[PDB]
Each structure stands twice: as structure tokens, then as C-alpha cells.
Amino acid sequence: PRGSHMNPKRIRALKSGKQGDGPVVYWMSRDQRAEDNWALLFSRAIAKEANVPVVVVFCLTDEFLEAGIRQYEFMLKGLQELEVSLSRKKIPSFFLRGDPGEKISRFVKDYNAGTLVTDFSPLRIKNQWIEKVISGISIPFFEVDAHNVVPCWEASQKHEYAAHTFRPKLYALLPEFLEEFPELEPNSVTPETLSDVLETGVKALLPERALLKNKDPLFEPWHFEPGEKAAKKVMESFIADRLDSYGALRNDPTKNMLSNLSPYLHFGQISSQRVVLEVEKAESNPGSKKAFLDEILIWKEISDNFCYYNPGYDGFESFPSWAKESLNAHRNDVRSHIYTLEEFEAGKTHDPLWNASQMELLSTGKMHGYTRMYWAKKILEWSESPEKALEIAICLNDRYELDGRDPNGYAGIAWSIGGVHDRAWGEREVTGKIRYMSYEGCKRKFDVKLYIEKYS
DNA sequence: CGGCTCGCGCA
DNA sequence: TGCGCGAAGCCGAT
Numbered sequence A: 001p002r003g004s005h006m007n008p009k010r011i012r013a014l015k016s017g018k019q020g021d022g023p024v025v026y027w028m029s030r031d032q033r034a035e036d037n038w039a040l041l042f043s044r045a046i047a048k049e050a051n052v053p054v055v056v057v058f059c060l061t062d063e064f065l066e067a068g069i070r071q072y073e074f075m076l077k078g079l080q081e082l083e084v085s086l087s088r089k090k091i092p093s094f095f096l097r098g099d100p101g102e103k104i105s106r107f108v109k110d111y112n113a114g115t116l117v118t119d120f121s122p123l124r125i126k127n128q129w130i131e132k133v134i135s136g137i138s139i140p141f142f143e144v145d146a147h148n149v150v151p152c153w154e155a156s157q158k159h160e161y162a163a164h165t166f167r168p169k170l171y172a173l174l175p176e177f178l179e180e181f182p183e184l185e186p187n188s189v190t191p192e193t194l195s196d197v198l199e200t201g202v203k204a205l206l207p208e209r210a211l212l213k214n215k216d217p218l219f220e221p222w223h224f225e226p227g228e229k230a231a232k233k234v235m236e237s238f239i240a241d242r243l244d245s246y247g248a249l250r251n252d253p254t255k256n257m258l259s260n261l262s263p264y265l266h267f268g269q270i271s272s273q274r275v276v277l278e279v280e281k282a283e284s285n286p287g288s289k290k291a292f293l294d295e296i297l298i299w300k301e302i303s304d305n306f307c308y309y310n311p312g313y314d315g316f317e318s319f320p321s322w323a324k325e326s327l328n329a330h331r332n333d334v335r336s337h338i339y340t341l342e343e344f345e346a347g348k349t350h351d352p353l354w355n356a357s358q359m360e361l362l363s364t365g366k367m368h369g370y371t372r373m374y375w376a377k378k379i380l381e382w383s384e385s386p387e388k389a390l391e392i393a394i395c396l397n398d399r400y401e402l403d404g405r406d407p408n409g410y411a412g413i414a415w416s417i418g419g420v421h422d423r424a425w426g427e428r429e430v431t432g433k434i435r436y437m438s439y440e441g442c443k444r445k446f447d448v449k450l451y452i453e454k455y456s
Numbered sequence B: 001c002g003g004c005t006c007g008c009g010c011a
Numbered sequence C: 001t002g003c004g005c006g007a008a009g010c011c012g013a014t
């Protein structure tokens, strides 16, 4: 409804009804940013057509107890900057604590909202909140895909087996959906503390903090500055300094040649469409430009496709039949080593390369992309069962990665353990036909000793 | 039937 | 280091 630079294919109606006379309320969950936000822009256009103001509601759930301080501070500090950014545009931001299924419905009734808009996320918990909200509200409810360049329900209607099947589909719809972002218009009609919730949450997560021998924290919070503004600087530095050499050095953990955009992209502090727009105009190495675009467009959005069309995305049942049969037949194979969650967590294994990868995960919260494959695949090799390996890999990924609890993580773990979006390889013990990685293979691609010595 | 985001031999 | 084969099941264009 309404909009000249707005594609209607980015919005879908979750619930029909009579449009109320109150303000249009935007339920911000995934895209925590002010600029290049389709969901916020569409909420403004609906408000403009109805001559009502637009407001933003963020519901703080109990999910931060499962995660750590590193994710809590990163999200909270970005929200504090976001509050000022919306305030400059005369857009009020309301922060609620509790279950969104009950808090959002209460806010709609109390604030007398006219229309409700929310961003899209294929996670299981989001669909549970939406269904609860729908039964408690009586105004139209819309969903906007502000995370993907091409809407998830529009790119493909089925689960995609491999990237080479999804690649032609995505690139065919690029000329339509890849476009510039109109500026956010400030509100014409004007009508909890973020510091207190930060202090309250931190005290609850203090006992669960990872520590060293001398009770010293392992996490180093100066590597990534949270916030919308800092994410712009990371993109600018990557395009100017790192994008040219990305194609040749993205598989070398000893070189900081990655975009470092996943923590910002996970919380929606920067738009992946915005990154694509600046990358496309950038005149750099054609090989590196193609390599980076294949990651942020295909592999990032196919991860949303995997979780959207597979409700068991974090389970063994989502694996392909060939992988399940191979893993089933190799259940009784004697493992070379057996490690529990705690031994994996502290990095007390016989592999010095695996332990160094974990320390980078512990200290920085963002382990290098190449070593994540080795990190996850060796968990399967040294665990009781494939279910145990999937349980440990998901737990350590969500607990310590800044980009954890993301569709890119569940798809990545399933790729490493269950061969999702992959193919069969040579037959092996324990791991069967799942793709294999060895220490000697990494030794021939990068300086392993430098990586190991960098992280003890 | 062609071709997919590893190890390994060889220059 | 970069290149080409090997080992493996299956989708998708016909």
C-alpha cells in the first residue's frame, strides 16, 4: 500500500482486518538500524498515507540468559545509539521486557495502534511470537523482509539442495530488487531505561562469564565497536583496503582480510543491500568482487532459505538422506578421541590447531571463517554420536560467536556436520562420506604455526 | 549426463 | 604456492 520507491513484493500480510485510527507501530526484532531499513521505511509510508505517526517497539526477551555478556553488550550499545538516531527523526522508540507474544499485544491495545509492522526472521521462536500476537490483536499485521536483498518467500518456494541451484534464481531477480534506499522521512505528528536494563542483565550474566586461570575475562571487547555508525566504517575500510585482496586471502586466518560484517549483519546494524550497492559500484579485482558477492548474497540468503523451509534446521533430521545413512552406518565406529562439552569449551584437545581456533572464538567472539570448518568438523570426529556433535557445535557457536543464534550459523553447522548444501566425498571411518578436513591440509594452505602462536 | 565453496601428487 | 585429478551422491535440464 502506497510508495513510489517501494516494492510491494517485500511485504506480506500476516493478518487482515480493519485499519485502526492509531499510529502505525513497528515491531523491530532483527534489523536494529535506522537507515536502509525497508521495514521502517514501509512503516513510515503507511503512517504517511494514514496521516498518523510511526513508533518503534523493541521487546527484550529472556533469551540473553542463554547467551553471554559479549552478545548482550553488543546489542544493547547499538540500541542506545539507535534510540538517539530515531529521536532525531522524531520517531519514539519503546523498549519492553517480557514475552513478545504477551507484551506486544498489550502494547497494541494500550497504545491504540492502527497497524502493526514487523521485520522477517525465519527462526522458530519468531514464528511462535507472531502466532501468539495475531490471536491477541485485531488490526492488520504485515511482515517486511528488511534483511535479504530478495525476499525469502520470493527468491524460492522450496528448500534448495545446493548453491548452484539457488545461484541462477537469486541473480535473475537482482535487477529488480537491488535498488537504492530512499531517505527516512521524520515524523510530523509527535505522539524502560536502556541503562538500567543493561546493568540488570549484566549482573545476571556475571556468573556465566568465561574466565581465565586468574579470574580474568577471556572476551576482548575492543575488536568490534558495536553500533550502526561503526558498521559503516567497517564496510568502508573493507571496500577500500581489504576487498581487492579478498579473493586470494579469504582462506588465510593469519591475514585479517575478511569483511568483519557478520556481527553487524546478524543484529541488523547494517544492511546487506547497502553493502552490495557499494561493492557493485567499487572498481576492484573482478575475482574478489565475484567471490565476496557469492558469500553475502547466495550463501547468506540461502541460510535464511534453509531455516525457513526446514523447521528442524538445528537437528539431525534436516540432513540429506545420503548423509543420514552414512552417519547411521558409522555410529559404532571407534572414535580416535572422545571429548565432552567442557573439554571442547576450554580447548583441552590433542589438536593444537583446533584449540587455537577455539581461543580466537573465546577471546574475540569471531573465529575465522576458514577455521570454523575445521573447528566444527573435528567435533564430529571426536564425539559420541552425530547428535552429540551437533549439540556441542550449536552450543559453542551460539554461546561464544558474536554472530551466533543466526541462520548463517545453523546452515553452516549443518554443512560441516550433515553435509547440508554439500555433496558426498571419499568414504572414511566415523565421518563416513561427509567432507573431510585434515591438519596437513591446512598446513599446505596457510601458516598454521603463526595462527597457533597468535592464540596460545 | 554435467558439475558441484575437500585431500593429494607434482612443478 | 597454483593446477588437475580422485572419490562420491544427486539435482536439474531434457
Ligand SMILES: Cc1cc2nc3c(=O)[nH]c(=O)nc-3n(C[C@H](O)[C@H](O)[C@H](O)COP(=O)(O)OP(=O)(O)OC[C@H]3O[C@@H](n4cnc5c(N)ncnc54)[C@H](O)[C@@H]3O)c2cc1C
Pocket: A250, A258, A259, A260, A261, A262, A265, A266, A295, A296, A297, A299, A300, A303, A367, A368, A369, A370, A372, A373, A376, A397, A398, A401, A403, A404, A405, A406, A408, A409, A410, A411, A412, A413, A416
Ligand atoms: C561451523 C560454522 C559456523 C558458523 N557460524 C556462524 C554464525 O554463527 N553466524 C554467522 O553469521 N555466520 C556463521 N558462519 C558463516 C561464516 O563463517 C561467517 O559468515 C564468517 O566467517 C564471518 O566472517 P566475515 O563475515 O568477515 O567473512 P566474509 O567472507 O567477509 O563474509 C561475508 C558475508 O557473507 C556471509 N557468509 C560468508 N560465509 C558464509 C557461510 N559459510 N555461510 C553463510 N553466510 C556466509 C555473511 O553474511 C558474511 O558476513 C559459520 C560458518 C561455519 C562453517
